[PDB]
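Ticket #4471: complex job returned nothing on first submit. Input attached below:
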Amino acid sequence: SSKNLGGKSSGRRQGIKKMEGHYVHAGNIIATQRHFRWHPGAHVGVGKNKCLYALEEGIVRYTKEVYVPHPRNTEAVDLITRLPKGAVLYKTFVHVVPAKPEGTFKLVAML
Amino acid sequence: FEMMRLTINRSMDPKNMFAIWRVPAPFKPITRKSVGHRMGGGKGAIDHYV
RNA sequence: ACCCCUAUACCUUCUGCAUAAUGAAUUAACUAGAAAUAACUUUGCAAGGAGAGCCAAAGCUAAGACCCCCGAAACCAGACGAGCUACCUAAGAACAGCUAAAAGAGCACACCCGUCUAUGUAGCAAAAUAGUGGGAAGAUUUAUAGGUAGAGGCGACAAACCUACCGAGCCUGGUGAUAGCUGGUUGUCCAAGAUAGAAUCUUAGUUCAACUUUAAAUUUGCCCACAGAACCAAAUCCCCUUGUAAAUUUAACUGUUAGUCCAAAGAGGAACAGCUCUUUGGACACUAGGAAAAAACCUUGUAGAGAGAGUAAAAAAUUUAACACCCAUAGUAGGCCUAAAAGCAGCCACCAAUUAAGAAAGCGUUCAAGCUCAACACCCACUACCUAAAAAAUCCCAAACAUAUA
RNA sequence: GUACCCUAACCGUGCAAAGGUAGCAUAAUCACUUGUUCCUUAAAUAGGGACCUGUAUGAAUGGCUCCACGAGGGUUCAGCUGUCUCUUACUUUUAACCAGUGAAAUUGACCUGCCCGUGAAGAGGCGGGCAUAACACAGCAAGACGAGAAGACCCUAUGGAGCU
RNA sequence: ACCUCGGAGCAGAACCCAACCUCCGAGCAGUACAUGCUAAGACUUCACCAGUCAAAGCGAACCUCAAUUGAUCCAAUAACUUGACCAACGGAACAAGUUACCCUAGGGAUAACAGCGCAAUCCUAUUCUAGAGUCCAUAUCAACAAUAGGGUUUACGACCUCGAUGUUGGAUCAGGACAUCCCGAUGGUGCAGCCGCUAUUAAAGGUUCGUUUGUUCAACGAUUAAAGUCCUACGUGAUCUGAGUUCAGACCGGAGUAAUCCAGGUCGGUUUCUAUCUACUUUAAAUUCCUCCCUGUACGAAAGGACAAGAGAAAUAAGGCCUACUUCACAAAGCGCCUUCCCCCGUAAAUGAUAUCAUCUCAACUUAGAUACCCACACCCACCCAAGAACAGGGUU
Ligand SMILES: C[NH+](C)c1cc(NC(=O)CNC(C)(C)C)c(O)c2c1C[C@H]1C[C@H]3[C@H]([NH+](C)C)C(O)=C(C(N)=O)C(=O)[C@@]3(O)C(O)=C1C2=O
Ligand SMILES: [Mg+2]
Ligand SMILES: [Mg+2]
Ligand SMILES: [Mg+2]
Ligand SMILES: [Mg+2]
Ligand SMILES: [Mg+2]
Ligand SMILES: [Mg+2]
Ligand SMILES: [Mg+2]
Ligand SMILES: [Mg+2]
Ligand SMILES: [Mg+2]
Ligand SMILES: [Mg+2]
Ligand SMILES: [Mg+2]
Ligand SMILES: [Mg+2]
Ligand SMILES: [Mg+2]
Ligand SMILES: [Mg+2]
Ligand SMILES: [Mg+2]
Ligand SMILES: [Mg+2]
Ligand SMILES: [Mg+2]
Ligand SMILES: [Mg+2]
Ligand SMILES: [Mg+2]
Ligand SMILES: [Mg+2]
Ligand SMILES: [Mg+2]
Ligand SMILES: [Mg+2]
Ligand SMILES: [Mg+2]
Ligand SMILES: [Mg+2]
Ligand SMILES: [Mg+2]
Ligand SMILES: [Mg+2]
Ligand SMILES: [Mg+2]
Ligand SMILES: [Mg+2]
Ligand SMILES: [Mg+2]
Ligand SMILES: [Mg+2]
Ligand SMILES: [Mg+2]
Ligand SMILES: [Mg+2]
Ligand SMILES: [Mg+2]
Ligand SMILES: [Mg+2]
Ligand SMILES: [Mg+2]
Ligand SMILES: [Mg+2]
Ligand SMILES: [Mg+2]
Ligand SMILES: [Mg+2]
Ligand SMILES: [Mg+2]
Ligand SMILES: [Mg+2]
Ligand SMILES: [Mg+2]
Ligand SMILES: [Mg+2]
Ligand SMILES: [Mg+2]
Ligand SMILES: [Mg+2]
Ligand SMILES: [Mg+2]
Ligand SMILES: [Mg+2]
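Support reply: We reran it on our side without changes. The output follows.
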């Protein structure tokens, strides 16, 4: 018998690739996720498979922030306008605190 | 359940006693395979409820 | 010398063998690791080296050092075989006696065969002997020559027979066929060394990874502080100190990739299995002591000698059931229902006299009648431990012991 | 669907090339099966006779009888007997002893016991107990998972071969 | 039945994680036509292959979805590009059955027999007191359910054995357990007696012959005191048989194009072994039935009808001997004859404390409650024997 078929797919190896305080470079993937568990914050970009990568080079920090969706996101705006008064939604966000300056001014000529 | 129900209903006084269950009805399904069947070949069909 | 104490042959195979798994009577002799690509080490010379060819952004040249043995059923080519046997050809031979005289007739010798039983089973015999049988003038038996041969012959088809193992003869050659399979693999000593997985006509194998080994180069490697890891339990990840000394990379490869128990979280099954499947962690496949013998439980690991010493784990405890005495009239056969249901079939109520008795708690009566309890008195006083089995097959299984100071 | 059960002479419907005919029939016959009835026996899963969509019989895949015949398979009357109740006695061979000659399979080494337990799960060899001077000869077959034949059944092999 | 891909649980919190485990899906669709080019840094289904995200830059503008898929070679094409339910989905360019006529290399890494583990199934005992039993749970039976035990069935596992652990029934010889079929003892009864039912104790002794069937079983005939349940490698094939079952021949029915097959029937079909080692090869107390009398007694309305005590007669078993009979004949045998002896424990009572009654007492206490055989021992060269395989033994006056 055993009419149950399929379900032989392997693990996706998803999750956090860069924890708190880890030095990160530009383009390094911070987290891979099937659903929006961790949200993009400052200097963290999102790729179309909801992946999180570092837009700048620095230190990864995980914070907890209020959640204000885009007024075009219909499902989110419906949830917000169906949320009772006095309640603010919270999500977990990932930031990269940039370590270096953008550049330096230095002497090149004595004209 | 039938043993308890019959014994308590027979032995009680229906004018001065009252009895209630604190245990729900049989809900967990217990499955049994066919007799003489070797090991494997899927999970057996549901036999009763506990 | 034995008697005392200790001691479960070896190899192979396996998760694990004293195993009643394999091999071995014993001795002597014989009998099994062949080599490249690269690397590493040591020389020579050196932007070149080599006795042409070739390689060269330190290389080139030379040397060293690394890759087993036996075994199928098979396939093909060319020979040799019909003195056995299958069938045929040529020319021969044999068949007493009796019935009836005709017969693929009957009884029955010789002769051919082989039904059944017994013996025999390395035998007298690689198919026999004794008895019992079928046929025995025919499609019979038999001597002599000859013929048909293997991708075939021959066959009253049993896939029978073709020189004592014919589903396709035998010999030689290809051939040292091949074997993911079994068996074997020969001096001494030391050291490191235990199993995530993925593919595969693949799960008896192999390749990559993983683990392991060696040689180099370098700097961090394990244990981890706080803070950090999501909405719909034990823990882990990350991680500075700190304690320690390993780790990563480069070069070269083999081998392991057929796994068992225990504790824990689960799944399947019977909340069966010395069952099957994952995960975490031990141990075993390595030593020693203990639990009786003992894989997996406990104690303990780094190696020698000692006729020294302190310790580790380490020896099962339990033995059960006494419960009172004395007393009892009566408003009433309370009412209803019923034939009666009277304290006691079923209903409503549950008052009330004696000092003190339920409009009755069990029995018991068709119903009655009866006898116990609760009640007076009585009196030492309710005395009140609140607990519970047994079986199987050779023969019970150490001997025993309650009392001399941890 | 139709004549109280069974069963349809009968009616309706669909498909096919034709829809199993005569005969036999519980079979040398799938399950039911030891089918039902009679004979045979004291007693019958045997044998013979009968019934029977045989729900898988059946006509040169030859069907059904019949005369002879058969080391074919089954049943049986009577007789016969050690076949047995129930075994005994004797002779020969074998045997045992003496003399001569003189093999083979087998064999890790053995100084080769019993009970219970244990253990790769069935111990002569381990644990606990018991037993125990040494050594031939005859006999037995419970054990040495006894000897023989690298299981004749099962599975595996990217191993074969024969046949269709 | 499944073979590839994805989601959820197992796998609760970084990752990973199996089962012929539990569920749900996928082999597309829709939009766009910059779905253009290029390029830091990363992730990665535990390898590789494959797959995934992406800053900046050039050029423009001002993709949704979960899986939704297929390598190399080769083929088509001028080119860009495009080709498999290669779904056994890391894919061999293209190949089915059958073998009982079979063969080889192995495997107890893997089935059949046996053992072992387990007890679902099977069996037993107890607890509880519904119910049945005129009444009455407990003379007897017994629902729902609970507790414990056994290892006889059918299974399940695959732990020893495939460089062989031979098999079903039957013969022969039996060893053992008691959960007792009979014989012994006792308690209860819905036990008047005879018969019964139920329970305790008892394994010394016994437990038949036939027809059919290969049967174990089962049915039937006739008995008996009874015709027990099991274990022993479903005891026992180096003791036997080979009827059955699973080699090669053949037939019937069916399946298949056929070879051939059927967990269907039928006829036939080789059962080797010289014993090396262990073990063993003479251990005297017997049971049961029937007959008579007791006795037509006890008992009982009658019909029916004992138990003890005692006497006799048998049968079997064990041991032995030939007087006769019989096979036979200096003798061995049975079909003949002779002999055969102790108890057995469940319970029922008396006295009497704990508890000044009572109480059979895990209170002290009282009652029911073996002999036999053998036994000395350098006469031995030799002969004989009722003694014996050899040896040994007895006799030789
Ligand atoms: C013993 N017999 C009944 C027999 C049985 C089987 N099958 C079994 O193993 C069955 N046993 C079970 C019941 C499964 C336990 C058997 O498998 C065999 C045989 C017989 C042999 C005979 C062989 C014979 N040789 C070796 C003595 C012989 O020469 C021939 C011949 N005609 O030439 C054979 O046929 C023979 O080799 C053979 O085939 C036999 C068996 O296969
Ligand atoms: Mg999954
Ligand atoms: Mg997986
Ligand atoms: Mg093994
Ligand atoms: Mg063996
Ligand atoms: Mg051995
Ligand atoms: Mg082997
Ligand atoms: Mg000739
Ligand atoms: Mg003639
Ligand atoms: Mg004749
Ligand atoms: Mg011929
Ligand atoms: Mg033929
Ligand atoms: Mg044939
Ligand atoms: Mg070879
Ligand atoms: Mg070492
Ligand atoms: Mg494969
Ligand atoms: Mg292989
Ligand atoms: Mg296991
Ligand atoms: Mg003839
Ligand atoms: Mg001699
Ligand atoms: Mg051992
Ligand atoms: Mg033993
Ligand atoms: Mg031995
Ligand atoms: Mg002897
Ligand atoms: Mg053997
Ligand atoms: Mg073999
Ligand atoms: Mg293979
Ligand atoms: Mg092949
Ligand atoms: Mg080949
Ligand atoms: Mg990867
Ligand atoms: Mg950009
Ligand atoms: Mg495949
Ligand atoms: Mg594949
Ligand atoms: Mg045949
Ligand atoms: Mg073989
Ligand atoms: Mg078995
Ligand atoms: Mg009643
Ligand atoms: Mg296993
Ligand atoms: Mg075997
Ligand atoms: Mg052997
Ligand atoms: Mg008893
Ligand atoms: Mg047997
Ligand atoms: Mg035997
Ligand atoms: Mg054969
Ligand atoms: Mg014959
Ligand atoms: Mg024999
Ligand atoms: Mg021995």
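Residues A 8, 10 surround magnesium ion (ligand 3) (CB under 6 Å). Closing as resolved unless it happens again.
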